[PDB]
Amino acid sequence: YTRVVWCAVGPEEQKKCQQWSQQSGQNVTCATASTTDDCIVLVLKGEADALNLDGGYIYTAGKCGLVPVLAENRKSSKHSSLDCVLRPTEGYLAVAVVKKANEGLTWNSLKDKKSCHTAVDRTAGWNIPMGLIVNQTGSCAFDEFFSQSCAPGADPKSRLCALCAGDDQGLDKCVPNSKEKYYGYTGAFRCLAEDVGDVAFVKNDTVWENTNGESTADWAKNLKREDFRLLCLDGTRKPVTEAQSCHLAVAPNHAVVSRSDRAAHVEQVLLHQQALFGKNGKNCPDKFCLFKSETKNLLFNDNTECLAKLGGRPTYEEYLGTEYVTAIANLKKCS
Amino acid sequence: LEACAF
Ligand SMILES: *[C@@H]1O[C@H](CO)[C@@H](O[C@@H]2O[C@H](CO)[C@@H](O)[C@H](O)[C@H]2NC(C)=O)[C@H](O)[C@H]1NC(C)=O
Ligand SMILES: *[C@@H]1O[C@H](CO)[C@@H](O[C@@H]2O[C@H](CO)[C@@H](O)[C@H](O)[C@H]2NC(C)=O)[C@H](O)[C@H]1NC(C)=O
Ligand SMILES: *[C@@H]1O[C@H](CO)[C@@H](O)[C@H](O)[C@H]1NC(C)=O
Ligand SMILES: [Fe+3]
Ligand SMILES: [Zn+2]
Ligand SMILES: [Zn+2]
């Protein structure tokens, strides 16, 4: 068998990857790059094997010939006797989140407000909301819609990065990795929690996992769910218990991609590494938990129960689904 | 809506 070379995005991921590599007896080793697109290039060069990707990045990777291998499966809403690895994935709910106290704001008055996005090119943070906004405004000028934003990966001098904050030192402002304070689901939801933004584009799970004590993180530890509302596309505002009726889209779960030539082996190695380090794995929490990182969603989302086998050996289009593929293609026409 | 970005 060969070792599998994981690609870690930024130094926090790299630190986790190195602990995993040590715990796996070097069955997994680590390459690191600054951004997800760079990891994708290491994988296309064959200098890394795999990483787990949001569906907007799966589209980038898939256009370049990389293939989905296993998908993130979180706890199911409904009962299933099937093992996690075989239980079908469900898709997460992209939402637009505001503060309850910001009473006047709805979907229809977002123009000129401040927004917080997980990063450019990610599903709930970018492709879904900006694709909807471009379509509804009839204008590709999405860089001018919000007065200011944090949208990691955008030009650091532009309004789309104005609200980003960088790392502890204020370096790396707007870089699309966990060094940036407002990066990712938890960093965009923190951008809203701290009222840096008026709106955060994240998924439903984000709000629940970072409120009412579910996170002990200093910035989250004291947030109340009731202080937040979801923006629905019909212009109404709802409590965050209503995401199933007040979302912008259902997103394909994050998934591992690799070169086609390495997919079989990546899939076999990961199935084994999660038997050891996954949720109730033989060596988690004793030795190392592959799906934990103190809320920071490093390498995998912290809410991942297991990586699950895909039905029908799907291509990346099949995996993402035809509508979402078309939605991205249409939005990408703007650039 | 075509080629690899890299
Ligand atoms: C929104 O996300 C939250 C967090 O994932 C979901 O709430 C969880 O649902 C699971 C399965 O029902 C429960 O067993 C967990 O206890 C819940 N977590 C928390 C922190 O309350 C919720 O179901 C999602 N809402 C929708 C409509 O999908
Ligand atoms: C933005 O608008 C485009 C243009 O209508 C949407 O694309 C259409 O999606 C439907 C269903 O997926 C297809 O049958 C049409 O053929 C598509 N049109 C084009 C030009 O491809 C797209 O879904 C919208 N983006 C969103 C909703 O995020
Ligand atoms: C590493 O992989 C080898 C080969 O499959 C396997 O025998 C061993 O159990 C694995 N050990 C760890 C810690 O992953
Ligand atoms: Fe995502
Ligand atoms: Zn829906
Ligand atoms: Zn197929």
Which CATH number covers residue A278? 3.40.190.10
Please state the φ and ψ torsions of residue A113, each to the nearest 5 degrees.
Answer: -90, 180
How far B1 CA lies from chain A's nearest CA (Å)?
5
At A8, the amino acid letter reads: A
Q: Which residue of A has its CA nearest to B4?
A: A64
Are residues A65 and A110 both part of a single domain?
Answer: no
Task: Count structural domains, chain A.
Answer: 2
Asked whether residue A332 is assigned to any structural domain, the reply reads no
User: Does residue A245 line the site of ligand 1, with CB under 6 A?
Assistant: no
Q: Which residues of A are annotated as a binding site for hydrogencarbonate?
A: 118, 122, 124-125
Are residues A179 and A293 both part of a single domain?
Answer: no
Are residues A213 and A298 both part of a single domain?
Answer: no
User: Does residue A29 line the site of ligand 3, with CB under 6 A?
Assistant: no
At A52, the amino acid letter reads: N
Instruction: Enter the resolution in angstroms.
Output: 1.8
Are residues A185 and A219 both part of a single domain?
Answer: yes
Tell me the best of A330, A332, A333 to mutate to test the pocket of ligand 2, counting ligand atoms within 8 Å of each CB and taking the most: A330
Q: Measure CA of the first residue to CA of the last residue in chain B; give whole Å.
A: 14
Name the structure determination technique: X-ray
Are residues A145 and A244 both part of a single domain?
Answer: yes
Alpha carbon A166 to chain centroid distance? 18
Tell me the best of A134, A247, A323, A326 to mutate to test the pocket of ligand 2, counting ligand atoms within 8 Å of each CB and taking the most: A326
DSSP string, A146-209: SSEEE-TTS-TTSGGGTT---STTS-STT-SSTTSTT-HHHHHHHHHHTTS-SEEEEEHHHHHH
Cα separations (Å) of A291 from A43, A181, A317?
22, 21, 26
Q: Which domain holds residue A32?
A: 2-73+255-316
H or E segment to which residue A295 belongs = none
Kindly list the protein residues whose Cβ atom lies closer than 6 A to any atom of ligand 2.
A 128, 131-132, 135, 323, 326-327, 330
Cα–Cα distance measured from residue A38 to residue A34, given in angstroms and rounded to the nearest whole number: 7
